[PDB]
């Protein structure tokens, strides 16, 4: 299940 507050930026 996905964390909505995971990092949404490019790596």
């Amino acid at each position, epitope marked *: 299940n996905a964390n*909505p*507050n995971a990092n*949404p*930026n*490019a790596n």
Partner: antibody
Amino acid sequence: QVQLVESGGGVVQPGTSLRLSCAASGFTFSSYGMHWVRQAPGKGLEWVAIIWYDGSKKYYADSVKGRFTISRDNSRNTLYLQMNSLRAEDTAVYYCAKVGEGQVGDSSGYYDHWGQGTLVTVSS
Amino acid sequence: DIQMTQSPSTLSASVGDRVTITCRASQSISSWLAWYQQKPGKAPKLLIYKASNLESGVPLRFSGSGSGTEFTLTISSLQPDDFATYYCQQYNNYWTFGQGTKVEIKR
């Protein structure tokens, strides 16, 4: 310096749909997640939606779920909010907001830059 | 949701005063708390993120403290530009704002 310019707001009738835009510049737009946040006249700030840098994940506030869609066109540095089945209580200034960098490892979602906002007035 | 409650909702202060605004989360949010300033008709501007980290360019009179469920924003010596509304925001699980605290001029 970061610039975020919203457009598309105006007076619309209830039950119609409307698309908002946010033109981004002064940073690498395609590397950042983005959010929309809104503020009804005289009220507080309300988070609306988030989209990943690559569009691969989107989340929405329960108040707009099933009615609003966030999207983006990275080749044009533009963020969109598609608002369907508009209601009187969607009247608000809509802000686009860039995700702040954070320190390494941090949970995400504070906003280091905000647009000036675009006013949507839902009225007959 | 994680409900954010600021205290007080309105604060009357004078220039030069030490001013503290409190923000409590109904669930533990670790350090993931930001503060914003808003003036009438203008977009909000970021002051503090990760509870205590001053955003680059923000004046040094602004600071923040806390973790878990209780947080504060302090203006060490209030200036005329500081009369405004302040919001906290958690970004631990989804994203929610406090109701705002207006800092008004005492007379």
